[PDB]
Amino acid sequence: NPMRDLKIEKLVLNISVGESGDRLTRASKVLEQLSGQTPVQSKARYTVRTFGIRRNEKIAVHVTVRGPKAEEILERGLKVKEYQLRDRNFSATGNFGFGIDEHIDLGIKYDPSIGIFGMDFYVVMNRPGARVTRRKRCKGTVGNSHKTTKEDTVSWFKQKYDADV
RNA sequence: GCCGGGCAGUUUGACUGGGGCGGUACGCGCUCGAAAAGAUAUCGAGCGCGCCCUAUGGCUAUCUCAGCCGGGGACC
């Protein structure tokens, strides 16, 4: 029972692409004093016409979560811009964060996404034992039974703090 | 020392469907030709080397990508 219940594992915020803290190391400042940690990431994909053609990229991305830091964040997080907080918005797996997608090559990849819900929010929902699949060892796979359902997912969060819409 | 075919001795290669012009199959590496051991020709087919690197060498420790999807073409 309690096992079946859905809770949020790692969320992680993120930022847009391009260089960050261009004038001075900034934009990391936001994400700072927000969420508590300070991630930074880099990128690949050299020739960008209006992007850089830098290889190793300063590119801003970051955040993550845990338990309880993203609660008390993802608190006063959701209840931010959500014209349609949920619906079609997230999908089979449980949760999402998106907006309007573009015709781009997708699907055959690990599936990180451009998608921007908020400063592209990533609530990811998983119930269960699930640490099973992720963890290195006999990985195991999710049952596709005890898997999240969007319906269940658009529950839990909604029951608390904010309407589904 | 300089100029110096005025004059003398010579050289000016080989391969090559004759020779010449072109080309080099003139040294060397791979696939195929090559006929399931080995060896095997043509101006046979496809194509390379005459270097570069103080790490792009040596050892040891430790060891996740493309791409796609979802949440905030950079990044998380």
Side-chain angles (χ1 to χ4, degrees):
Chain A
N1 193 309
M3 56 170 189
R4 296 307 83 247
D5 292 346
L6 294 63
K7 50 68 179 178
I8 60 78
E9 61 282 352
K10 317 138 286 69
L11 43 308
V12 27
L13 62 74
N14 202 324
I15 196 67
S16 183
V17 297
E19 62 284 344
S20 180
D22 188 2
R23 59 180 69 268
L24 297 297
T25 181
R26 300 286 290 269
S28 64
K29 80 294 257 292
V30 63
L31 87 82
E32 285 180 0
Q33 295 78 59
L34 188 180
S35 294
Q37 295 310 136
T38 301
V40 59
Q41 71 167 188
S42 64
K43 193 175 77 300
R45 180 70 180 186
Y46 160 64
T47 300
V48 254
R49 58 162 70 181
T50 192
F51 278 94
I53 53 181
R54 145 254 56 267
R55 292 72 173 183
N56 60 121
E57 215 315 68
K58 293 299 180 292
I59 180 61
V61 180
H62 48 273
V63 180
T64 179
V65 276
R66 58 342 91 226
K69 216 304 153 50
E71 278 59 41
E72 52 99 12
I73 75 83
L74 187 274
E75 292 286 358
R76 291 189 68 166
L78 190 286
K79 182 71 177 184
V80 290
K81 293 167 180 180
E82 290 85 51
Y83 291 105
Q84 61 286 144
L85 193 187
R86 67 84 183 190
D87 273 313
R88 149 194 273 149
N89 208 8
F90 38 81
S91 199
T93 185
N95 280 174
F96 283 153
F98 230 132
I100 295 296
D101 62 330
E102 180 186 4
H103 282 84
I104 301 169
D105 197 1
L106 292 70
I108 59 170
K109 220 303 217 48
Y110 199 46
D111 277 88
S113 181
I114 171 282
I116 180 168
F117 184 81
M119 295 179 275
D120 51 294
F121 207 111
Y122 241 5
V123 173
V124 62
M125 277 193 163
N126 274 313
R127 312 138 312 295
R131 68 331 108 157
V132 180
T133 301
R134 295 180 296 88
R135 288 301 78 248
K136 292 297 180 178
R137 61 274 294 273
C138 294
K139 300 298 180 65
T141 301
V142 296
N144 189 358
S145 295
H146 44 278
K147 70 297 181 177
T148 301
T149 63
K150 74 298 278 295
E151 66 171 3
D152 290 346
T153 210
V154 53
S155 180
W156 293 102
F157 292 109
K158 285 314 174 300
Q159 69 176 182
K160 63 294 274 62
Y161 63 81
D162 279 314
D164 59 330
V165 180

